[PDB]
Amino acid sequence: STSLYKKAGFDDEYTKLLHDGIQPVAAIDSNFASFTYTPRSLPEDDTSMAILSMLQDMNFINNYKIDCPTLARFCLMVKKGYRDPPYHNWMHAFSVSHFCYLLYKNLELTNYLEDIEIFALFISCMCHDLDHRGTNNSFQVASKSVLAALYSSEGSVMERHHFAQAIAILNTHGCNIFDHFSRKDYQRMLDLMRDIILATDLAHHLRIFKDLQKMAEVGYDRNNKQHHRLLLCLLMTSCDLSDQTKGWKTTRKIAELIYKEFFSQGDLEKAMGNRPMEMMDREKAYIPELQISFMEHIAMPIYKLLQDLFPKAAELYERVASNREHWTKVSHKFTIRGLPSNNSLDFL
């Protein structure tokens, strides 16, 4: 079935990073630190090297005295910790991480948050969807999975699992990048990573929205600890939906990947004798309308809030609005429900 997604495992890629894993960012691409860069254009084999390059460029390898081969092992473990569903794979975590690096390079993050908080945001970006199965939180509960048994009573099933997988990698032999960290700082990292990963659940975003709005309405406070907590949540959700800030071709390809993933879950729910949500039912979903709704209600407010706090982020919101206008303009060519027989949106 289209719902079966494999895990890589349980030396040549490590030695390659040990050879020339730290390359100056400009050698990767002259456009690498721009909001016009598309990290999905980077070959998958060069992504682990780009992670190190961004960490070095932000100076986190020297500021935190991170042992380079420990970081090389950790990155490869994070990469290996992703399965291969159409959307929630390593290439998604890599692109989300790159956008966190873009926010640091283009917005003045050091003038809003502590070095430790931005470093936590980046690491959380790499880990935020670890071991994702191509299915959502409702599916875990309905399929009565081990993950639902462990976490449903606490809420955010997948997000708690993703954080647990990040902790397991850290507690693996030679992957603890924070090994030399002090007891209070090591725990600070674990606590930041937990809140940041939990902020990737839509349910959470929907609950903190009024508070995000009020923070932007009043104005950011560099001395207010709660303001640092709320900013990190908005920044995490902006990294997670960052493919919408790119060109039309990226939003069109990401729609193709997410609906292939959503539709496979729906087919699995139908085989289980359950009725899927409309967006997960290939016989009911009309992708342009679903995209417009997702962009109006979820993506556009997140970037509108980011524009209110960071003036330099205005271009991001306008690209998201433009992509939304593009889906309305294209809806006349897309006259069918679901995806075409070949799973491609290239015809648009």
Ligand SMILES: C[C@H](c1ccc(C(F)(F)F)cc1)n1c2c(c3cc(F)cc(S(C)(=O)=O)c31)CCC[C@H]2CC(=O)O
């Ligand atoms: C997983 C993703 C998402 C959305 C918001 C947040 C955030 F930032 F708000 F926190 C995180 C993650 N997602 C979801 C939808 C959705 C629609 C789309 F058209 C595109 C995406 S995409 C391309 O970004 O995968 C969608 C609808 C229901 C919620 C969610 C799926 C689910 O988890 O049940």
Ligand SMILES: [Mg+2]
């Ligand atoms: Mg997620």
Ligand SMILES: [Zn+2]
């Ligand atoms: Zn994600």
